[PDB]
Write a protein that binds this DNA or RNA. Structure first.
Ligand SMILES: [Mg+2]
Lengths: 39, 101, 49
RNA sequence: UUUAAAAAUUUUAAAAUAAUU
C-alpha cells in the first residue's frame, strides 16, 4: 500500500512530475465533494 | 552583453570547488567520463533535464564525484539515479535563486 | 528444484537492460517506451521458479 | 515538420591555513 501511494498507481516511471502534480491536485480537489460522497 | 548571464548567476550562488586532497589525483577525467548523467537502464522521465537548463549538469557531476570519492576502496563508475520532484522542478528551484540577485 | 539442479540454462535479466539502454529517444517528451517496458517487466532474478 | 550545441572566462584585490624562495 505504501509503494502504491508512492507511485501514480504502483510505478512512477510513466508520468512526468508536471502531469503527476496536476492530477494529484485534481483528485485532492474532488476528494470530499458530495459527488463522491419540513411542512 | 555576450555570454548570457545564466552561468555567472549560478557561479555566484553556489560554492562548490575541488577540495584540497584531490589536487594530487586526476579528477578531470573523472568529471568528464566517469560520472554519467544517463542512468544505467536508460531514461526515467525524472532524470530528464530541460534544454535551457545546462548548469544543472555541473552540480550533478559534483555530487556524483564526491559520493564516489568519499567511499573507501576503488573509485567506481557512478550513474545518476533519481531526482525527487523532477529535472525542471529542481532547475526552477535553482533559477529563482539565480534570479534573486 | 531438480530442474534447477540439472539444467544448464541460466536466466540473467541484464540482457534486457543492456539492450534497452541503447535505445535512441529524445528527452523533451512525456512518454518513453524503453522506461515503460522496463517498469512493466522488472527484470529481477528473485522468482524464476 | 520538432529538438538541441548554450559562455571555459581570470591571472580574483583583500583577510585566515598549509608548501616553498
Ligand atoms: Mg633560500
Amino acid at each position: 500500500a505504501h509503494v502504491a501511494s508512492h507511485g501514480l498507481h504502483g510505478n512512477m516511471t510513466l508520468t512526468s512530475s508536471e502531469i503527476q502534480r496536476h492530477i494529484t491536485e485534481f483528485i485532492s480537489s474532488w476528494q470530499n465533494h458530495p459527488i463522491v460522497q419540513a411542512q | 552583453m555576450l555570454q548570457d548571464v545564466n552561468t555567472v548567476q549560478l557561479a555566484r550562488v553556489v560554492n562548490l570547488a575541488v577540495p584540497d586532497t584531490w589536487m594530487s589525483l586526476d579528477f578531470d577525467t573523472m568529471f568528464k567520463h566517469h560520472v554519467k548523467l544517463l542512468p544505467k537502464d536508460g531514461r526515467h522521465l525524472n532524470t530528464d533535464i530541460p534544454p535551457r537548463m545546462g548548469w544543472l549538469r555541473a552540480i550533478l557531476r559534483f555530487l556524483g564525484a564526491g559520493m564516489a570519492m568519499t567511499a573507501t576502496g576503488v573509485a567506481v563508475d557512478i550513474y545518476l539515479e533519481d531526482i525527487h520532484g523532477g529535472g525542471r522542478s529542481l532547475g526552477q528551484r535553482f533559477m529563482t535563486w539565480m534570479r534573486q540577485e | 528444484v531438480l530442474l534447477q539442479r540439472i539444467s544448464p540454462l541460466q536466466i540473467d535479466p541484464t540482457i534486457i537492460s543492456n539492450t534497452m539502454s541503447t535505445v535512441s529517444e529524445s528527452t523533451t517528451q512525456t512518454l518513453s517506451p524503453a522506461s515503460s517496458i522496463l517498469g512493466k517487466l522488472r527484470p529481477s532474478n528473485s522468482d524464476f521458479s
